[PDB]
Design a protein around this ligand. Structure first.
Ligand SMILES: Cn1c(=O)n(C2CCCC2)c(=O)c2cc(Cl)c(C(=O)C3=C(O)C=CCC3=O)cc21
Ligand SMILES: Cn1c(=O)n(C2CCCC2)c(=O)c2cc(Cl)c(C(=O)C3=C(O)C=CCC3=O)cc21
Ligand SMILES: [Co+2]
Ligand SMILES: [Co+2]
Lengths: 381, 381
């Protein structure tokens, strides 16, 4: 069931912003690693004396990477006179964020019809304000509320190119990398307690609990009216024998935060081939491959949907496959993006639910937990 | 003249250590960008609950990248019980360094016969101590004194694999990249005042002023007995019309620090081809090419040393060429390595001075300052 109870008009995921200590180096690593083009900058060369910000794009996916300059460059400025293109930026908040969490996501940004309204209704409905609505060059309105930990949910709206004050990067610097990634499918948070996190977030957005369908997790997924903004949230399951990865996250991250970003590919096989080509020459590493018994059991479960060749192609690249009652899900997980065992990336592709494809088609992989336990039974097979 | 007045036995450059906020991402960028292999780690997977450290190697060149974990992982430790493989590391110093300077070099490390002696004699002779000598697993001794700004000169000595507590990385993770870079030739500091910086450093090392031979700089080069450790130091020339780049460095870096690392290649042409192949897909950018009039004038100056083809090959890659009274120098400069216009890299190759090649053969490029002014005269040619 879908109550469609959004308290304001939500469009799509708009961008993800990483807070870094050096934005240049993270952005160049991510660009090679994921096949994302350099498409806009805001930094010293564009008159920004406050922060360096570099935008990477692949399809509709927008990864923003921001780091602070020395405060002494902008010490003579005040908020009315600022050179920062993102007015919510704060030297102190950014340094504290990065020293506390290391590299990670500061903002999950969603486009909305009216960001000032979305902020007002949100704060009216329990949201902890983070940065009040600000109208940039009479063109774009930007507002931030607290989502969980030190991650903000960022509203952006356009009357009618990323943000004012950003320049398009010179194409001689802009190499058209592309490994098939196209949009953000879901962004997932880890918290110590799922209940209060849920009722807080659903409280101020009006997002509803999404469909879906004993290892470490309890989760639930919040979704907008058309279920194109998908916001899962995890909590640890204490007391088990293998320590909860959610609990390991909270310890190394110093509390709640964004656990993983799921990027949709239009061709998960080409994406995974290309990312695996570059794992050891600057790119990203991937979780260990499941045992071939896993793949010796997928014929009995999705042989309907994938040919005997594609199932073997899955075995090469280490792809995981799950299946809702409507669609099928292909998914794989990277190793952590940085020093800490905290944030990681998930590459996915969804097959089914044609009307366009409806959101969350196939789910998030729920069945693959029990299916990997009863496949790591291969020790005598 | 060479007094050979080293106050202790100095061998060669041993490694350069960058202090970062995320060591993983800088190291992977640098590895792709410079063609350096991953050869050793010390991090959570090796029991280090304090810092993540990743070593890149090309030839004898060793780039070390270190970032702090959350202090809470090691809060129950004391210095006698530490899990840090580098005992001089300090969460507070590292965070303060990186928030103050951004990405940059924390240590210039030189191998010496006896690091405890080198520290004692150094401190006896004016050196500001930074970390006292510590003997690691009865195998390696490590000591640090202040060099300039927040950069330390690090002494290391071996009784008889990088450091104890580092592991060699699994070769499946270790891709044998190589673009021809082989060793560190010189490491250069910017300071506000050259005199006191000079007499401080020469004071405690016994290094002597090196050979050599109106834009922005005053410099001088300190050198060990065999002149294989070369430590130039710059100061700004105020009052000119084009603001001193040294002065721009001091402002954006928040004071003195390491300005550039010069890496020797055994084939500057293959190095520059390979690095330029990767500039826009994660690697490093290079300074703007000099005008072809520069290259139309190199025949008259080094046509003795380089064929008409190699001189044109220089023009492709943007290589600069200078000439001492003994040798010839090929050199080119990258754009800054990170967000700030502070640290950058220089690729060089030296031709001449065969006895082995003697240090500093060809100099450091002194003649190329006046030669670029009187070549940017091409506006009417
Ligand atoms: C399917 N699956 C899995 O099998 N494992 C295996 C791999 C071997 C050991 C345990 C995971 O670790 C794993 C981890 C995550 Cl975060 C997800 C995931 O995407 C996810 C969501 O998007 C939303 C809510 C909960 C949720 O779990 C799926 C996983
Ligand atoms: C030769 N040369 C040059 O021509 N320029 C040009 C390029 C167009 C505008 C000015 C430089 O900026 C430049 C910069 C540096 Cl740091 C060096 C260099 O390596 C160096 C040392 O190693 C040691 C002491 C001093 C010193 O200067 C050489 C340069
Ligand atoms: Co997921
Ligand atoms: Co130099």
């Amino acid at each position: 069931k879908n109550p469609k109870s959004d308290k304001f008009k939500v469009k799509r995921f708009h961008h993800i912003e990483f807070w870094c200590g050096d934005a240049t180096n993270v952005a160049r690593r991510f660009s090679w690693g994921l096949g994302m083009r350099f498409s806009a900058k805001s930094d010293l060369s564009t008159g920004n004396m406050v922060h360096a910000s570099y935008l990477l794009t692949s399809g509709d996916l927008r990864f923003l990477f921001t780091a602070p300059y020395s405060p002494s460059l902008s010490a003579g400025e005040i908020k009315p006179t600022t050179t920062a293109s993102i007015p919510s930026f704060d030297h102190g908040s950014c340094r504290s964020f990065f020293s506390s969490h290391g590299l990670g996501v500061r903002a999950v940004a969603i486009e909305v019809e009216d960001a000032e309204s979305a902020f007002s209704i949100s704060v009216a409905n329990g949201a902890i304000p983070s940065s009040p609505p600000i109208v940039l060059n009479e063109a774009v309105t930007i507002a931030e509320v607290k989502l969980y930990g030190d991650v903000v949910l960022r509203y952006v709206s356009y009357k009618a190119e990323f943000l004012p004050g950003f320049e398009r990067v010179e194409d001689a610097s802009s190499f058209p990398l592309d490994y098939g990634i196209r949009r953000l499918d879901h962004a997932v948070g880890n918290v110590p307690e799922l209940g209060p996190a849920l009722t807080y977030v659903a409280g101020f957005t009006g997002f509803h609990q999404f469909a879906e369908f004993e290892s470490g997790l309890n989760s639930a997924v919040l979704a907008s009216n058309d279920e194109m903004v998908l916001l899962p949230i995890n909590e640890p399951v204490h007391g088990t024998k293998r320590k909860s990865q959610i609990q390991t996250y909270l310890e190394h991250n110093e509390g709640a935060g964004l656990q993983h970003l799921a990027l949709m590919s239009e061709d998960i096989f080409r994406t995974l081939r290309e990312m695996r080509k570059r794992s050891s020459i600057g790119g990203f590493d991937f979780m260990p491959s499941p045992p071939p018994t896993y793949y010796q059991n997928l014929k009995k479960r999705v042989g309907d949907v994938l040919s005997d060749d594609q199932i073997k192609e899955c075995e090469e690249l280490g792809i995981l496959v799950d299946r809702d009652d409507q669609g099928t899900l292909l998914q794989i997980f990277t190793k952590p993006l940085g020093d800490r065992p905290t944030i990681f990336i998930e590459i996915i592709q969804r097959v089914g639910c044609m009307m366009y494809q409806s959101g969350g088609c196939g789910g998030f992989g729920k069945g693959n937990f029990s299916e990997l336990f009863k496949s790591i039974e291969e020790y005598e097979k």
